Amino acid sequence: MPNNEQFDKLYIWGVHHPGTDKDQIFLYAQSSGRITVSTKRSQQAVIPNIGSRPRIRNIPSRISIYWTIVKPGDILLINSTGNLIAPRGYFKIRSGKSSIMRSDAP
Amino acid sequence: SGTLEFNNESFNWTGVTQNGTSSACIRRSNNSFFSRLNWLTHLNFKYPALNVTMPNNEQFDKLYIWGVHHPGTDKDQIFLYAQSSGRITVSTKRSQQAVIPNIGSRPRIRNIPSRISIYWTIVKPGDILLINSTGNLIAPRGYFKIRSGKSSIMRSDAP
Amino acid sequence: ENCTLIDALLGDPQCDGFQNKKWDLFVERSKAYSNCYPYDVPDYASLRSLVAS
Amino acid sequence: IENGWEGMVDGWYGFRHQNSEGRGQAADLKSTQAAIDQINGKLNRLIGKTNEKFH
Amino acid sequence: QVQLLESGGGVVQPGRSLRLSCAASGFTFSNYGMHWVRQAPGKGLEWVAIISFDGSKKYYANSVKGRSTISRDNSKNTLSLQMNSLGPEDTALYYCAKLPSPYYFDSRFVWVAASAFHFWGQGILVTVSSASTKGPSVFPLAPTAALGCLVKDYFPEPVTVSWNSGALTSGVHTFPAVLQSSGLYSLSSVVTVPSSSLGTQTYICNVNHKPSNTKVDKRVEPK
Numbered sequence A: 001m002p003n004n005e006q007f008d009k010l011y012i013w014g015v016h017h018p019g020t021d022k023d024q025i026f027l028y029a030q031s032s033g034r035i036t037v038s039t040k041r042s043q044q045a046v047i048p049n050i051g052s053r054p055r056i057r058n059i060p061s062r063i064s065i066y067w068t069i070v071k072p073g074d075i076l077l078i079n080s081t082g083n084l085i086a087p088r089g090y091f092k093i094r095s096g097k098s099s100i101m102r103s104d105a106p
Numbered sequence B: 001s002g003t004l005e006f007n008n009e010s011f012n013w014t015g016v017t018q019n020g021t022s023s024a025c026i027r028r029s030n031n032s033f034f035s036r037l038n039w040l041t042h043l044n045f046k047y048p049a050l051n052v053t054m055p056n057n058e059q060f061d062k063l064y065i066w067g068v069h070h071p072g073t074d075k076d077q078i079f080l081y082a083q084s085s086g087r088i089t090v091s092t093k094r095s096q097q098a099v100i101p102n103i104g105s106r107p108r109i110r111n112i113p114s115r116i117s118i119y120w121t122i123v124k125p126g127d128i129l130l131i132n133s134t135g136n137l138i139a140p141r142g143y144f145k146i147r148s149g150k151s152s153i154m155r156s157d158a159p
Numbered sequence C: 001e002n003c004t005l006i007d008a009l010l011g012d013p014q015c016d017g018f019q020n021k022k023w024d025l026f027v028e029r030s031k032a033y034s035n036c037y038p039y040d041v042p043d044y045a046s047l048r049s050l051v052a053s
Numbered sequence D: 001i002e003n004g005w006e007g008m009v010d011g012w013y014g015f016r017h018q019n020s021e022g023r024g025q026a027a028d029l030k031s032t033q034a035a036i037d038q039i040n041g042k043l044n045r046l047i048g049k050t051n052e053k054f055h
Numbered sequence E: 001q002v003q004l005l006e007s008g009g010g011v012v013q014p015g016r017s018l019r020l021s022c023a024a025s026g027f028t029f030s031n032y033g034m035h036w037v038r039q040a041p042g043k044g045l046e047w048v049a050i051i052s053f054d055g056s057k058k059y060y061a062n063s064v065k066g067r068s069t070i071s072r073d074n075s076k077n078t079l080s081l082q083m084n085s086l087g088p089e090d091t092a093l094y095y096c097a098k099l100p101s102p103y104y105f106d107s108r109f110v111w112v113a114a115s116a117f118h119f120w121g122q123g124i125l126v127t128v129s130s131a132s133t134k135g136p137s138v139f140p141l142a143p144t145a146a147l148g149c150l151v152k153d154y155f156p157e158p159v160t161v162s163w164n165s166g167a168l169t170s171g172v173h174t175f176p177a178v179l180q181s182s183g184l185y186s187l188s189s190v191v192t193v194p195s196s197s198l199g200t201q202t203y204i205c206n207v208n209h210k211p212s213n214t215k216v217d218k219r220v221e222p223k
């Protein structure tokens, strides 16, 4: 996916670590995945680590989430063979003066 | 934290050989190992997949210390675990970490060409520690109380 | 209200009123939670801080 | 001085006098004005000068 | 902030008397001493009078000394000014305003502060002449492009100009007042719009003269 605009783009994606092995087969018809998200100036490879987790909402599996910033003129590239939680689009990311604060105040 | 208060806990290490020792960890004229770690090795040439859950029903956080054994050679790995490579996954409702043993010769220290990489995991009240492995696991024995104290450390040769 | 900034980002089904929204200050409530598929974020704080800014 | 004068409420510094034609009290003006201007400048420097810090 | 309403403007025949009254709200009138200042049309700033927060001290300008009077009411939150024996040098805008002043004109409570309360009101216009107040006359003038409306024949100065119910704010040129050997005023209001807006959109000017009950609108275009 290229980037021909005049601003940076923030791509959010992830990888699915399933709780069991036949879960992995059922979902991807193969043993183990290997995700490689890359750009002219960056790269990151993530490996799904299959294994049972403490059940949360009766789900014994997990999702590890990563982000990748694509500069103008850059070209996002995604390579995978399974366990990929693909992105749908991109976020505009600005040089703003906004922030966050944790508070229970009304 | 400011304390080493330790409490053993009885995990279900069924089907493996507990209490591994070594000739570099000498305790009282006999081979031994870290008093707080349990070196799990194979039993009857078979290392069954370990899936052990330990809850936390107290009112404080618990600190679990564990590790992974990187052996110097490959037949070392076979001799110890009767399988090619391990894969350790320590998880909790709010956390997870997977560690992979990287087999390879190291510079000999105390005639040992292998290593141990040590990790820690904090289990909150109501959480549930879960351990999953298939070899090369240096299991924990119990848990440490960890407090919101005002203690600290300082490196000094002063008497 | 019930949504940490990350759940609004990924788009937790209860956190849909925040889609495409802008802000100058995000007030994270202590009662917030996540009612969707579990997950964890390597460098959570870093992503949170950059999305906030 | 030994103490202050409480009855003075149209100024801060004053004269008191007692001559054969009575006793009287009258406050000096420009001294009080010069003492009020400096305190007002002090406050104007102090209050309301707060800088922004966002993230 | 503070909101005041000003009353008593208009035209007073020579030798007669005026009556201005500034009534404010939103702050503590009881504490602050007030000023009356005047500004002759053209240019210049001439101070008139000053009154304390109770009425103890009232001081006047030498140019009006002995023929003017100031007053205040604290229950109605009102400041007021009177002046008799008026001439052409007195026709002006009159501002009611809290100016920085010696401290004793203000209350004990507001001598020291970091904000230094201040405000001016809009002008109150008073004009002296033979009071022949008549209605204006508006003529549109027209052929890069430029078009305007010229309004003459009105003595009371407060004339306002709007364009097409008040939408055009760009290139709007409002011209200063003009006085002649006669007593009438003249004033034109123009706008430069490039030469590609004849059939694109045509405009209408609006002339609002309040102290004659006058609202006169008229379209602008070439012959």
Ligand SMILES: *[C@@H]1O[C@H](CO)[C@@H](O[C@@H]2O[C@H](CO)[C@@H](O[C@@H]3O[C@H](CO)[C@@H](O)[C@H](O)[C@@H]3O)[C@H](O)[C@H]2NC(C)=O)[C@H](O)[C@H]1NC(C)=O
Pocket (backbone or CB within 6 Å): A019, A020, A052, A053, A054, A055, A056, A060, B051, B052, B053, B128
């Ligand atoms: C490794 O061991 C852990 C814990 O010993 C296993 O997780 C546990 O799996 C059981 C079986 O599904 C779960 O029981 C279920 O509980 C829910 C509660 O509502 C109930 O609806 C079901 O009918 C069933 O009884 C249990 O909750 C779950 N515990 C945790 C903490 O996840 C795990 O499955 C084991 N892994 C493998 C590969 O066997």
Ligand SMILES: *[C@@H]1O[C@H](CO)[C@@H](O[C@@H]2O[C@H](CO)[C@@H](O[C@@H]3O[C@H](CO)[C@@H](O)[C@H](O)[C@@H]3O)[C@H](O)[C@H]2NC(C)=O)[C@H](O)[C@H]1NC(C)=O
Pocket (backbone or CB within 6 Å): A034, A035, A036, A079, A080, A081
């Ligand atoms: C990264 O992306 C590339 C792009 O497709 C992947 O390369 C492709 O990998 C698959 C299997 O991993 C190859 O399919 C196999 O090809 C051999 C070639 O002889 C064939 O005998 C097999 O039956 C099977 O069809 C595919 O050819 C290959 N394509 C190219 C252009 O190299 C790669 O696997 C991806 N890697 C990761 C980590 O995602």
Ligand SMILES: *[C@@H]1O[C@H](CO)[C@@H](O[C@@H]2O[C@H](CO)[C@@H](O[C@@H]3O[C@H](CO)[C@@H](O)[C@H](O)[C@@H]3O)[C@H](O)[C@H]2NC(C)=O)[C@H](O)[C@H]1NC(C)=O
Pocket (backbone or CB within 6 Å): B072, B073, B105, B106, B107, B108, B109, B113
């Ligand atoms: C890869 O190469 C390294 C170094 O070239 C090997 O480590 C070396 O192995 C030799 C053979 O065991 C060690 O020699 C021993 O020295 C002790 C000293 O007290 C002595 O008691 C023994 O009889 C023997 O001579 C040597 O110390 C050791 N050096 C280091 C730095 O570890 C390593 O074994 C090689 N890896 C493989 C897989 O072959």
Ligand SMILES: *[C@@H]1O[C@H](CO)[C@@H](O[C@@H]2O[C@H](CO)[C@@H](O[C@@H]3O[C@H](CO)[C@@H](O)[C@H](O)[C@@H]3O)[C@H](O)[C@H]2NC(C)=O)[C@H](O)[C@H]1NC(C)=O
Pocket (backbone or CB within 6 Å): A020, A021, A050, A051, A052, B049, B050, B051, B087, B088, B089, B132, B133, B134
């Ligand atoms: C995480 O823990 C689970 C819990 O035991 C491990 O799953 C177990 O994995 C072993 C081999 O890795 C499985 O044994 C094999 O099962 C197949 C099933 O057809 C059988 O044909 C083989 O002969 C062998 O017995 C075992 O069934 C499986 N158990 C479950 C409940 O899935 C898992 O391997 C652990 N993973 C890690 C990374 O520690």
Ligand SMILES: *[C@@H]1O[C@H](CO)[C@@H](O[C@@H]2O[C@H](CO)[C@@H](O[C@@H]3O[C@H](CO)[C@@H](O)[C@H](O)[C@@H]3O)[C@H](O)[C@H]2NC(C)=O)[C@H](O)[C@H]1NC(C)=O
Pocket (backbone or CB within 6 Å): C001, C002, C014
């Ligand atoms: C943010 O989260 C809180 C708590 O999760 C939400 O409060 C919830 O409000 C609903 C009203 O829509 C409550 O529904 C209840 O329904 C039962 C019938 O099933 C009825 O008997 C009750 O009187 C009540 O109406 C619900 O109890 C309550 N949640 C909890 C856990 O008590 C709140 O609405 C959320 N805000 C947003 C904007 O999503």
Ligand SMILES: *[C@@H]1O[C@H](CO)[C@@H](O[C@@H]2O[C@H](CO)[C@@H](O)[C@H](O)[C@H]2NC(C)=O)[C@H](O)[C@H]1NC(C)=O
Pocket (backbone or CB within 6 Å): B008, B018, B019
């Ligand atoms: C492994 O070693 C530990 C201690 O090194 C042994 O723990 C003992 O367990 C018995 C119960 O069987 C307790 O009564 C002792 O108090 C424990 N000792 C200590 C020091 O905690 C454990 O039994 C050994 N297990 C095997 C299989 O050898």
